[PDB]
């Protein structure tokens, strides 16, 4: 459940990516396929060798969903609804690889934004990062 | 643990350069502000009611002296990590009462710390390396429930 | 995240249990204490034999808190405040705790009303303790 | 797993009792209800997109029946359940890739089921002893990890 100080410091620390979103969101991913290739089979169809294409797309959404994600801080079960849909009806994804994406994309931060990933943004986004791997794991429609 | 020669040096060469007075108390201090629940296990500590009370507190930076310590004991004993964490395994489990699930949070904390430290040179295989070992160290500590 | 289907289950398999409320809480507490003895640390200052008035007792502020959250469930950060600044705030209790008081109330539930505990209604009972267990264990204020 | 006399008899007890054909179904169809993502393991079985369909499924019933024997070989090797479970343990890791916590996750499943058939039978020390049981089965389970 987010405070008030964790939807600012959120907005905060994900509006000083900006630009660098998809590339951030790139190497999360890529950062997840190593160190838990089990995570791996759920792309089977993509190429995930370095520098791909295709890892560097997703990258992208996944960044653009997270950005969507901030913005309605306050309502993300009906503005990542079509979301939770994918990866909880669809995919029936297992909310431990919500974590260890969650994980990378916090490794991520750290270490491509030092002088913004404080404890507590690290705390705020790790809160965040919970609340959207929740609703994009639970079946709530 | 098992770990290629490649990951064995990737990360020895990465934690000979590691500032042994700051990573272990930012890990440490970084568990308690991102989980809250820990400070419970740490009540003697004094002042851990803000972040900046956290980070700037002695006993957070003493005791994560001290715990960097054993993930360095760790690395040193790769083959046999149960053995390393016997009696630490027994202080946590039978004696401080702390749930494993925290060991694999203190080690994912530990390696954010390890990648805002090192920046760009905490390449995706250098955590996936680091990962390994982690793992090995929080399992290895739960191995008295085992 | 709770769907409608849920939020009607919960409502339904909870407004079932009545006036036995206090004593299926005493034994959620009982269950808890004795399957794991850690949960124990949280209560030195209770006496936690059986027939003990302070599980009873305890008991049933767990079930009125549960029931509050059943009739508020689309509120429960606000209505359960209070209870979040006592666990998250004051006690700092371990959310593991939470999933084994959880699981003990799900037991107790499939113990002692067989016929409302179906397949569907453990699924969203679990998915409410776990919400309710959200709320208690996060610092939001 | 150590258990006293007094709850291993509790423990066998209850568990002669066990209906073998609805047990073991009940607590497989029950974790792929309560624990949706599960479902992704299980889909060579066909129809599991609402409660009655997987409750009524004869793969989920088979194979829920084949989980439930597993955990009976478990509580006749209780002092060796590494053993007993490494080559389960295998293809769970290995072969499957099931997160470790899923294990847990059935465990407890399990639980709800026998107390739900036992009703007032499955008392609190009852319920106590097989959670040592399926906390010492989950974690057999997950030692290729380990
Ligand atoms: C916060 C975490 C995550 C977010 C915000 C997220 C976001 C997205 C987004 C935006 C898409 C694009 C689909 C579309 O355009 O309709 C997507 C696709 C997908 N996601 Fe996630 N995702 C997350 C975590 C995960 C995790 C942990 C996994 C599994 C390891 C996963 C597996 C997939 C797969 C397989 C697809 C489809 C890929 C394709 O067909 O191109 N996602 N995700
Ligand atoms: C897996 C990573 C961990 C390692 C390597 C680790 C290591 C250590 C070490 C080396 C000590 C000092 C032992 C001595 O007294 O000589 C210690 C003490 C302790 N650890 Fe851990 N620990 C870990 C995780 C945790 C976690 C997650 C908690 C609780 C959240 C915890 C709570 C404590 C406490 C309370 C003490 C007693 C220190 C004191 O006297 O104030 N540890 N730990
Ligand atoms: C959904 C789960 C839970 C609910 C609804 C709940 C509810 C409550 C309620 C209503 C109170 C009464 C306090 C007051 O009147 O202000 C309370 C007290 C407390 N709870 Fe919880 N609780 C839950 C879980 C837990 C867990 C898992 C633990 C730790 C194992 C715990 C430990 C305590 C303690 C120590 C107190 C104070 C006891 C006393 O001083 O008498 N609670 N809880
Ligand atoms: C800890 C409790 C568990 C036990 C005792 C257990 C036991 C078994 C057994 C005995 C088998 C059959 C082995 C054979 O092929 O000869 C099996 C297969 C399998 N188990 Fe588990 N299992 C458990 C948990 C899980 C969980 C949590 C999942 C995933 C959610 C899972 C997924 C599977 C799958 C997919 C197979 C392959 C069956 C097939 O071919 O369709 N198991 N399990
Ligand atoms: C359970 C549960 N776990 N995590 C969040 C919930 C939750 C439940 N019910 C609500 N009505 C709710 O409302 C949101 C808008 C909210 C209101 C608050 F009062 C405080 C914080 C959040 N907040 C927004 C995003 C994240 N948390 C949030
Ligand atoms: C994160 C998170 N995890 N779990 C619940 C949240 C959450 C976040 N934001 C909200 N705005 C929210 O609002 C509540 C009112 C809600 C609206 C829905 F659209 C669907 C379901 C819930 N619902 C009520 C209780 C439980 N879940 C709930």
């Known amino acids: 459940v987010l405070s008030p100080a964790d939807k600012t410091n959120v907005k905060a620390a994900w509006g000083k990516v900006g630009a660098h979103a998809g590339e951030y969101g790139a190497e999360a991913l890529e950062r997840m396929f190593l160190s838990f290739p089990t995570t791996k089979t759920y792309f089977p169809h993509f190429d995930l060798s370095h520098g791909s294409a295709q890892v560097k797309g997703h990258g992208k959404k996944v960044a653009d969903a997270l950005t969507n994600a901030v913005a309605h801080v306050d309502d993300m079960p009906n503005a990542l609804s079509a979301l939770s849909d994918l990866h909880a009806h669809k995919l029936r994804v297992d909310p431990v690889n919500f974590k260890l994406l969650s994980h990378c994309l916090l490794v991520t931060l750290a270490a491509h934004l030092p002088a913004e990933f404080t404890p507590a943004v690290h705390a705020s986004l790790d809160k965040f990062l919970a609340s959207v791997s929740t609703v994009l794991t639970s079946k709530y429609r | ?146």
Chains 1, 3 share one sequence.
């Open chain 2, 1 to 146: 643990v098992h770990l290629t020669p490649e990951e064995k040096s990737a990360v020895t060469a990465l934690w000979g350069k590691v500032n042994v007075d700051e990573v272990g108390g930012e890990a440490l201090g970084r568990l308690l502000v991102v989980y809250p629940w820990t400070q419970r296990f740490f009540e003697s500590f004094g002042d851990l009611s803000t972040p900046d009370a956290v980070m700037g507190n002695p006993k957070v930076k003493a005791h994560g002296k001290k715990v960097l310590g054993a993930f360095s004991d760790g690395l040193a004993h790769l083959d046999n990590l149960k053995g390393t964490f016997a009696t630490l395994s027994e202080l946590h489990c039978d004696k401080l009462h702390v749930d494993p699930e925290n060991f694999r949070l203190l080690g994912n904390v530990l390696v954010c710390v390890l990648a805002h430290h090192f920046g760009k040179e905490f390449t995706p295989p250098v955590q996936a390396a680091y990962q390994k070992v982690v793992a090995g160290v929080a399992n290895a500590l739960a191995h008295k429930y085992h």
